[PDB]
Design an enzyme around this catalytic site. Structure first.
Site, PDB file in Angstrom:
ATOM      1  CE  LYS A   1      -2.132  -1.856   3.297  1.00 36.05           C
ATOM      2  NZ  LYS A   1      -1.339  -2.943   2.667  1.00 36.05           N
TER       3      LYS A   1
ATOM      4  CE1 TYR B   1      -8.860  -5.373   2.246  1.00 36.29           C
ATOM      5  CE2 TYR B   1      -8.402  -4.098   0.280  1.00 36.29           C
ATOM      6  CZ  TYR B   1      -7.960  -4.771   1.396  1.00 36.29           C
ATOM      7  OH  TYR B   1      -6.614  -4.837   1.666  1.00 36.29           O
TER       8      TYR B   1
ATOM      9  CG  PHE C   1     -12.322  -1.427   9.724  1.00 37.87           C
ATOM     10  CD1 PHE C   1     -12.517  -0.480  10.714  1.00 37.87           C
ATOM     11  CD2 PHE C   1     -11.571  -2.551  10.017  1.00 37.87           C
ATOM     12  CE1 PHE C   1     -11.970  -0.650  11.970  1.00 37.87           C
ATOM     13  CE2 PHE C   1     -11.022  -2.728  11.269  1.00 37.87           C
ATOM     14  CZ  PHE C   1     -11.221  -1.776  12.248  1.00 37.87           C
TER      15      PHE C   1
ATOM     16  NE  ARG D   1      -3.059 -13.231   8.845  1.00 32.25           N
ATOM     17  CZ  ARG D   1      -3.778 -12.713   7.861  1.00 32.25           C
ATOM     18  NH1 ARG D   1      -3.545 -13.023   6.597  1.00 32.25           N
ATOM     19  NH2 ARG D   1      -4.755 -11.858   8.152  1.00 32.25           N
TER      20      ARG D   1
ATOM     21  CB  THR E   1      -3.993  -7.452  11.953  1.00 31.17           C
ATOM     22  OG1 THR E   1      -4.476  -7.346  13.297  1.00 31.17           O
ATOM     23  CG2 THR E   1      -4.088  -8.899  11.499  1.00 31.17           C
TER      24      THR E   1
ATOM     25  NE  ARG F   1       0.902  -4.790   8.611  1.00 32.64           N
ATOM     26  CZ  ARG F   1      -0.352  -5.144   8.858  1.00 32.64           C
ATOM     27  NH1 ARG F   1      -1.102  -4.474   9.712  1.00 32.64           N
ATOM     28  NH2 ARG F   1      -0.866  -6.198   8.232  1.00 32.64           N
TER      29      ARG F   1
ATOM     30  CG  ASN G   1      -2.266  -2.134   7.054  1.00 27.43           C
ATOM     31  OD1 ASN G   1      -2.759  -1.246   6.363  1.00 27.43           O
ATOM     32  ND2 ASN G   1      -2.544  -3.419   6.875  1.00 27.43           N
TER      33      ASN G   1
ATOM     34  CG  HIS H   1      -3.638  -7.067   2.519  1.00 21.90           C
ATOM     35  ND1 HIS H   1      -3.848  -8.133   1.670  1.00 21.90           N
ATOM     36  CD2 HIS H   1      -4.707  -7.031   3.349  1.00 21.90           C
ATOM     37  CE1 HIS H   1      -4.993  -8.716   1.976  1.00 21.90           C
ATOM     38  NE2 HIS H   1      -5.533  -8.068   2.991  1.00 21.90           N
TER      39      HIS H   1
ATOM     40  CD  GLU I   1      -8.634 -10.614  -3.003  1.00 22.17           C
ATOM     41  OE1 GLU I   1      -8.921  -9.960  -4.027  1.00 22.17           O
ATOM     42  OE2 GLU I   1      -9.430 -10.719  -2.046  1.00 22.17           O
TER      43      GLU I   1
END
Ligand SMILES: Nc1nc2c(ncn2[C@@H]2O[C@H](COP(=O)(O)OP(=O)(O)OP(=O)(O)O)[C@@H](O)[C@H]2O)c(=O)[nH]1
Ligand SMILES: Nc1nc2c(ncn2[C@@H]2O[C@H](COP(=O)(O)OP(=O)(O)O)[C@@H](O)[C@H]2O)c(=O)[nH]1
Ligand SMILES: [Mg+2]
Lengths: 49, 249, 77, 369, 434, 430
Positions: free
Chosen positions: D95, D133, D141, D169, D175, D189, D199, D202, D213
């Site tokens: 992002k 999303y 959110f 992950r 998160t 992160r 953040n 992803h 995705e």
């Protein structure tokens, strides 16, 4: 009656090369500019060595 | 397009709306790929005529291939009680992505790694039956269910009772640790005689299970496991008396 | 020929080792009833023909048209 | 000991037809054996070629003895089972709050041991972002995330590897980034996270969502146009040996640190006609057009577009001598000095003429689409 | 504007028609459905006719009495290419009997055959001639071919006919009564076929064994090679070249006397896909290989006889001066000897189009080829052996009842015997120098 | 298209035909209820050759079932695959022949054959194009050897052009089962010669030797012998039902194998036959198949082939192979054994190719031969006949039912004549 298509095809065929030569010369001039550029760069590199 | 071309071949030309209606009447699954086998079967049954005395046989749906899966099950029996679980484990392993379906070459691979060198002709029959409309993928769950056969309702209910009884001692929580710590290794003799030692029996049991003793277990997975175990045994009586000894119930 | 004789009915195992014991053994293993079912019937097909490799080939008069060269599909220039 | 055997096919050019061999690999001593399926003669016998274990996978390409081979599939159960484990696919996202940290992010991702299968960057437009999303919708959110999403350019990548769906992950961390500092400071992160909605990156969470995705972002039918300009910009190419030897993360941050603005990078697989064709300006000059063209097509390569006030010669200044052996002696801080090995594989390649950058960048980002 | 008509009768005729037609379809790039993707000179007119919109239909007709091969073709991979009702199929096999297919059952199909030939020839406008394929050593093939030749030689007349017939091998043979049929069919075709070409089997077996190194060949390789020969022969009518030769430039340049029109062929190069690119493939070496007796299309030793006329056709990028020098060396070497009354004996044709290769085939993609057709006195030995076999099995009236019971009279054997003896005498007489 | 009808009479005929139809139904993928459950489309292209379609889509054989007693039909109907045969195709007598040729050929055979003649007439006329008839029967029994041969004469009377095949279980003295064998054997072979277009002789003794040696089964059964005969007889007509490279019909076989009108008695063989424990230990190749098929001990007849010279031979290869090795093996076997082939006819071997092997098999070979070695059977039969006839033993049961010893003398004369000019060609030279 069939000769018209032959005439057209010949015209396109010869025009194709007639413009291909211009394309080739357009590509070829950049050849010389780039060759001169790296030629000068290399001698500058050597002298600074 | 090929369908309306075939209609033109016989000489019945109709407008696109009527053609679409006729196509959809027989394309019930809405996939868009009709089966001319069922088409001609329907026409033959219509043209045979109505006779109460004689049935018109013929076929309106694709039949089970029969002897290819029969021999498959018979030869799968010989390897051992957990050959059935081997096929499940192999299907999950090959389906590394977890969609529920496999590609054609992947199905070939899972077959040969199980070890059955099916020829092209024998493979093709089961292949074409299990893939109705040549979509390109086969559902392994239905395939393994048909290979195993039919499970009894009372047997499944007993398996559910065993799962609940096991969860009761742990308070409703599940672990492979529980099944490993409590069972009867010697009960395997009654499903089939074996000369292997009781000390090793635990080793094969844990090996066919997962190495980790904290893996999560679902009720469906558990009953699936014992259904694979049962499918090797040909007697419901023997299977349930084995289960009773295995859980002391 | 004094077959049967000192080898009566027995299922599974290596037998008695007289007569054609070897040959009856594999028949008995592949199919029940090693020798002459009592009048469990015996199918003559397995006894006569042998191991069955089920396969149906193509005429290969119809292979004339179909032949593929994967190389031709390259973009070239 | 144990043997890994495959099926491979090689495209001859003197012979139109393609052939097929097996390429057995003795792993106890790292040697290669070549045998062909048809006509039953041994092709290449018992000669070591020093091929690393990591590059063997479905779809890989490897050169040997001046002929390039492309692995298609395995050849037996024993080989298939061992490498079947390493096939999981995950979809990672960068992002735009960390647009300055792309190089470090990619470096850490590579050091994790996963493989960067495919990479692209685009502008995620408003409507398709709202479509994405989709499950959240009702929660508060949603609107904040959507407004954040279409803010700026975004980098989407695919990671293929063992245990990847949760390995990525756990490498990423919690998160929330606020917690990430106290629990796991050494995390993506943790290092580059600011707040809950800002953040850094992803990752996927379930295989189904990951696939969704994936065919949303990389499949042939995508609504994501390659947002890139075509004026006052220069093009550069990460050569395949660089990505094979894993310094792409280091290279990218180096050019970002110089104040130049990256406009688009994408992963490309191109064949020998395309390679010679893009090098149409070097056919008749000494950089040995044939060797460099044949090397350029020996693996994946990144095509980057760089933007600056005076793009061409300024970027040339940082690029330095075309020969890294030249560069080491005199321009010790230039990227080709730091990363290039020799003449043929001198790391980065950039345009070396004032008025031809636009056509070259157009060639990659318009013609090859 | 220029076209030919293809006749395919007998199982051999049909199984060679399949190969020649797949080759012709591939050469012009016609898909099996008949469509032309193209992407346009009229080089398909020789073999195909446009339907007005889209597909093209071949100008060929298929005859046979046992429905098996015809149905297999109708359900093959070219089902929608051929014209459905020009694939004429009978009811019962002639079953290796000459009289059956020429006196009893063959008479109820010739009417349909002539009707279809008329319908197709009326569509044709500049018909050049007929190319016929048939197996001599079989009942239906021989009988129906003889009847068709009889009918056409009267109905159409002067239009040329070339027949590519498949005689028995000296020992590699299938049937047992087959020499009878061979003799009778030769008698029938002698005064009706303008050109005859030898296509025995075991010679081509040896060819494929020696060159392709194929130890497992079937009829398909044989038919593919024969189709290659036919395409090389007929290329000149439809492709541009330096020296074009049409079908009428065969008998006017290769037939010394009306009775002598039996000929034998050869084709080169014949090589696999591995041994080709390590070889030179020079014009001189391919034309030297074309004259090797072991490379010949029929089991005969041309060294036992003289040469009368040779017609060679090159395709590719050959050069006329190279051809001339090669021919000079051919005349120079003494192993091959010509007849005195033929000072010049070579016909030369040149075509620009290189040979086309079929995917999944045996031959490699080659840039030069030569096909040679030779008329020579060395044809006497095959006929001599056939006569010897006929005499040995006719000394005691073997299998004569099977023929006489179908309607044919007994005396026909003597006439064929005497005419074959006269032909042998003629080939002997032409061999004496002046 | 070019379909053939089946007729079977007597106990031997009934059992042989039952096994044959089980084999054909298995090969064509037809269940015992008559519903197609096959795999490939090739099984339906020529399904009408041996089967007729009825309303509803079930297939029924065009077979005729004939005998003087109902027991054997009642057994075969109850046995497996007994429901395929149409119940109207049964014709049975209430008395029985008693192994007496006169009984089965003059009185009750004649008064009974009208019905079977009607049935065969309607069945033959129903189909589009007959190709011929095939008969399976025994010359050693009463009802078969009499009524079947009279039916052969009758059908030949109205169908002079169509081909007829016979499959005759001829007697051999080693396995002797009846004392009146010479009488009915000679009479049957008398009225067989002028009517039967092809004859194929089979010996129970030869079948027993084959089963004990090649298959090596400890205790065989008539099921095995019937299955072997079914395999060979089914392999005969493969070109008519399946596509191939060289199709060869019964008329082709007759033309290629019959040099003279009276020489049509043939001897057959099948390959490959291997023991169950050695099935995986041998290769499958054309040299192996030809070596096995040419073997004299492999033959289905008690006559020794190497005691005479082959006149003509034919082979029906099935499966995948190549024509050059086929014909090269024929040339090799013709060259290395020139003593066993008559010289004045060159290239006396037929080869034919079918693309469809039997189900579960890769390659198969059916061999049919016309050789001079078959004269020994007639010689020994005539020896027994004259030795037992010089005393007129058992003669009166014949002579008391419209029989005269003059036609017995005629039969002896005819068989001696056939032996004479059939062994003449063994010594005949060019
Ligand atoms: N080279 C080659 N020869 C073939 C082929 N098919 C058949 N023949 C030849 O045909 C000859 C026998 O004739 P058949 O093919 O049986 O057919 P026919 O000549 O029309 O006569 P019938 O058999 O009655 O149909 C054989 O000797 C073969 O040489 C083939 O595909 N290739
Ligand atoms: N191979 C074989 N021979 C058989 C079979 N059944 C009977 N036979 C022979 O046939 C002879 C007796 O024939 P028979 O039944 O009396 O003839 P029928 O009275 O005319 O029906 C005996 O010699 C047996 O060997 C069989 O199923 N197979
Ligand atoms: Mg034929």
């Amino acid at each position: 009656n069939r000769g018209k298509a032959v005439n057209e095809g010949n015209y396109i065929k010869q025009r194709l090369a007639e413009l291909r030569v211009r394309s080739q010369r357009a590509l070829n001039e950049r050849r010389q500019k780039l060759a001169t550029l790296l030629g000068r760069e290399h001698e500058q590199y050597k002298q600074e060595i | 397009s090929q369908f309306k071309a075939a209609l033109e071949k016989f000489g019945c030309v109709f407008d696109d709306k009527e053609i679409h209606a006729l196509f959809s009447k027989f394309d019930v699954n809405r996939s868009g790929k009709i089966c001319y086998d069922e088409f001609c079967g329907n026409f033959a049954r219509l043209g045979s005529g109505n006779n109460p005395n004689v049935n018109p046989v013929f076929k309106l749906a694709r039949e089970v291939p029969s002897p290819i899966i029969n021999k498959l099950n018979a030869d799968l029996k010989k390897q051992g009680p957990f050959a059935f679980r081997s096929l499940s484990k192999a299907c999950q392993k090959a389906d590394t992505f977890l969609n529920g379906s496999l590609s054609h070459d992947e199905f070939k691979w899972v077959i040969k790694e199980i070890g059955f060198s099916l020829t092209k002709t024998e493979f093709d029959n089961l292949f074409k039956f299990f893939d109705k409309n040549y979509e390109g993928k086969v559902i392994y769950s239905v395939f393994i269910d048909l290979v195993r056969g039919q499970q009894s309702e009372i047997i499944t209910q007993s398996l559910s009772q065993g799962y609940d009884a096991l969860a009761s001692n742990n308070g409703g929580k599940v672990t492979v640790e529980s099944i490993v710590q409590r069972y009867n290794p010697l009960a395997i003799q009654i499903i089939y005689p074996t000369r292997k030692i009781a000390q090793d029996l635990q080793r094969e049991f844990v090996a066919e299970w997962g190495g980790n003793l904290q893996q999560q277990v679902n009720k469906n997975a558990f009953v699936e496991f014992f259904s694979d175990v049962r499918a090797f045994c040909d007697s419901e009586s023997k299977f349930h008396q084995y289960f009773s000894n295995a859980f002391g119930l | 020929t004094t077959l049967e004789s000192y080898n009566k009915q027995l299922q599974k195992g290596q037998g008695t080792l007289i007569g054609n014991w070897w040959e009856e053994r594999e028949l008995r293993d592949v199919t029940g009833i090693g020798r002459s079912a009592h009048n469990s019937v015996n199918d003559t097909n397995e006894r006569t023909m042998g191991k069955k490799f089920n396969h149906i080939p193509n005429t290969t008069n119809s292979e004339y048209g179909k032949g593929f060269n994967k190389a031709d599909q390259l973009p070239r220039t | 000991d144990i043997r890994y055997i495959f099926i491979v096919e090689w495209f001859d050019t003197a012979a139109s037809l393609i052939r097929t061999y097996y390429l057995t690999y003795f792993t106890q001593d790292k040697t290669i054996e070549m045998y062909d399926l048809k006509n039953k003669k041994v092709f290449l016998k018992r000669c070591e070629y020093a091929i690393k274990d990591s590059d063997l996978y479905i779809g890989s390409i490897l050169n040997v003895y001046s002929r390039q081979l492309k692995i298609v599939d395995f050849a037996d159960v024993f080989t298939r089972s061992k490498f079947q484990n390493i096939k999981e696919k995950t979809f990672a996202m960068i992002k735009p709050d960390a647009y300055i940290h792309i190089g470090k992010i990619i470096s850490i991702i590579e050091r994790s041991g996963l493989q960067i299968s495919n990479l692209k960057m685009t502008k995620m437009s408003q409507e398709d972002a709202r479509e994405f999303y989709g499950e959240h919708k009702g929660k508060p959110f949603y609107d904040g995330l959507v407004n954040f999403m279409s803010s700026d350019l975004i980098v989407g990548m695919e990671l293929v590897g063992d245990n990847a769906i949760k390995r990525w992950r756990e490498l990423l961390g919690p998160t929330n980034t606020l917690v990430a500092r106290e629990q796991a400071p050494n995390s993506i992160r943790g290092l580059f996270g600011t707040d809950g909605t800002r953040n850094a990156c992803h990752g996927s969470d379930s295989p189904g969502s990951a696939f969704r995705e994936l065919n949303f972002f990389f499949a042939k039918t995508s609504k994501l146009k390659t947002q890139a300009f075509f004026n006052q910009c220069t093009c550069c190419v990460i050569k395949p040996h660089i990505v094979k030897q894993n310094q792409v993360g280091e290279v990218i941050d180096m050019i970002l640190s110089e104040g130049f603005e990256i406009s688009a990078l994408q992963t490309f697989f191109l064949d020998r006609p395309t390679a010679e064709e893009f090098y149409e300006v070097y056919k008749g000059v000494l950089p040995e057009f044939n060797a460099i063209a044949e090397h350029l097509t020996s693996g994946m390569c990144y095509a980057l577009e760089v933007r600056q006030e005076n793009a061409v010669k300024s970027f040339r200044d940082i690029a330095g001598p075309h020969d890294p052996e030249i560069a080491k002696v005199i321009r010790p801080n230039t990227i080709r000095a730091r990363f290039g090995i020799d003449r043929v594989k001198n790391g980065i390649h950039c345009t070396d003429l004032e008025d031809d950058g636009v056509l070259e960048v157009e060639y990659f980002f318009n013609a090859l689409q | 504007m220029r076209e030919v008509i293809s006749i395919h009768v007998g199982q051999g005729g049909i199984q060679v028609g399949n190969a020649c037609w797949e080759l012709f379809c591939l050469e012009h790039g016609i898909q099996p459905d008949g469509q032309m993707p193209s992407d346009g000179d009229d080089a398909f007119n020789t073999f195909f006719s446009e339907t007005g919109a889209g597909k093209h239909v071949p100008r060929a007709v298929f005859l046979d009495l046992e429905p098996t091969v015809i149905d297999e073709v109708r359900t093959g991979t070219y089902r929608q290419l051929f014209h459905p009702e020009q694939l004429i199929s009978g009811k019962e096999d002639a079953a290796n009997n000459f009289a059956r297919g020429h006196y009893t059952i063959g008479k109820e199909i010739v009417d349909l055959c002539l009707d279809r030939i008329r319908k197709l020839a009326d569509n044709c406008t500049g018909l050049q001639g007929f190319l016929v394929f048939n197996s001599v050593g079989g009942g239906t093939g021989s009988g129906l071919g003889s009847l068709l030749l009889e009918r056409l030689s009267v109905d159409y007349g002067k239009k040329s006919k070339l027949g590519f017939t498949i005689y028995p091998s000296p020992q590699v043979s299938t049937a047992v009564v087959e020499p009878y049929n061979s003799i009778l069919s030769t008698h029938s075709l002698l005064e009706h076929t303008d050109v005859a070409v030898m296509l025995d089997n075991e010679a081509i077996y040896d060819i494929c064994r020696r060159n392709l190194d194929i130890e497992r060949p079937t009829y398909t390789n044989l038919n593919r090679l024969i189709a290659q020969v036919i395409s090389s022969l007929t290329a000149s009518l439809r492709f541009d070249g330096a020296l074009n030769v049409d079908i009428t430039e065969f008998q006017t340049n290769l037939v010394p006397y009306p009775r002598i029109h039996f000929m034998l062929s050869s084709y080169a190069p014949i090589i696999s896909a591995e041994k080709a690119y390590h070889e030179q493939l020079s014009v001189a070496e391919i034309t030297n290989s074309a004259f090797e007796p072991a490379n010949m299309m029929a089991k005969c030793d041309p060294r036992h006889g003289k040469y009368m006329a040779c017609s060679m056709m090159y395709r590719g990028d050959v050069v006329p001066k190279d051809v001339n020098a090669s021919i000079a060396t051919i005349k120079t070497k003494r192993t091959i000897q010509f007849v005195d009354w033929c000072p010049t004996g070579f016909k030369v044709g040149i075509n620009y189009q290189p040979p086309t290769v079929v995917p999944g085939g045996d031959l490699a993609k080659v840039m030069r080829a030569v096909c040679m057709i030779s008329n020579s006195t060395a044809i006497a030995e095959v006929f001599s052996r056939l006569d010897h076999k006929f005499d040995l099995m006719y000394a005691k009236r073997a299998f004569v009842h099977w023929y006489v019971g179908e309607g044919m009279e007994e005396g026909e054997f003597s006439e064929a015997r005497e005419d074959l003896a006269a032909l042998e005498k003629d080939y002997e007489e032409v061999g004496i120098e002046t | 298209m070019r379909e053939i009808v089946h007729i079977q009479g007597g106990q031997c005929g009934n059992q042989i035909g039952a096994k044959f139809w089980e084999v054909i139904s298995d090969e064509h993928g037809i269940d015992p209820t008559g519903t197609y459950h096959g795999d490939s489309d090739l099984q339906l292209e020529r399904i009408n050759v041996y089967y007729n379609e009825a309303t509803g889509g079930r297939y029924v054989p065009r077979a005729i079932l004939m005998d003087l007693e109902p027991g054997t039909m009642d057994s075969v109907r109850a046995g497996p695959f007994g429901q395929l045969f149409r119940p109207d195709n049964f014709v049975f007598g209430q008395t029985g022949a008693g192994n007496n040729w006169a009984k089965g050929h003059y009185t009750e055979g004649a008064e009974l054959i009208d019905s079977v003649l009607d049935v065969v007439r309607k069945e033959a006329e129903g189909c589009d194009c007959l190709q011929g008839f095939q008969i399976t029967h025994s010359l050693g029994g009463g009802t078969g050897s009499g009524m079947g041969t009279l039916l052969i004469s009758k059908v030949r009377e109205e169908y002079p052009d169509r081909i007829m095949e016979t499959f005759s279980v001829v007697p051999s003295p080693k396995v002797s089962d009846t004392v009146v064998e010479p009488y009915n054997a000679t009479l049957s072979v008398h009225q067989l010669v002028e009517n039967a277009d092809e004859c194929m002789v089979i010996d129970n003794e030869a079948l027993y030797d084959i089963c004990f040696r090649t298959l090596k089964l400890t205790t065989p059964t008539y099921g095995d012998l019937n299955h072997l005969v079914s395999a060979a007889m089914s392999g005969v007509t493969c070109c008519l039902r399946f596509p191939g490279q060289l199709n060869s019909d019964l008329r082709k076989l007759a033309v290629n194998l019959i040099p003279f009108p009276r020489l049509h008695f043939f001897m057959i063989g099948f390959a490959p036959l291997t023991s169950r424990g050695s099935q995986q230990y041998r290769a499958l190749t054309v040299p192996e198949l030809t070596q096995q098929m040419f073997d004299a001990k492999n033959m289905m007849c008690a006559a020794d082939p190497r005691h005479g010279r082959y006149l003509t031979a034919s082979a029906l290869f099935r499966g995948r192979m190549s024509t050059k090795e086929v014909d090269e093996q024929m040339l090799n076997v013709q060259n290395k054994n020139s003593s066993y082939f008559v010289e004045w006819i060159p290239n006396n071997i037929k080869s034919s190719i079918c693309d469809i092997p039997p189900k579960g098999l890769k390659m198969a070979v059916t061999f049919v031969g016309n050789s001079t070695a078959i004269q020994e059977m007639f010689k020994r039969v005539a020896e027994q006949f004259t030795a037992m006839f010089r005393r007129k033993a058992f003669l009166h049961w014949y002579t008391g039912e419209g029989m005269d010893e003059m036609e017995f003398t005629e039969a002896e004369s005819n068989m001696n004549d056939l032996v004479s000019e059939y062994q003449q060609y063994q010594d005949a030279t060019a």
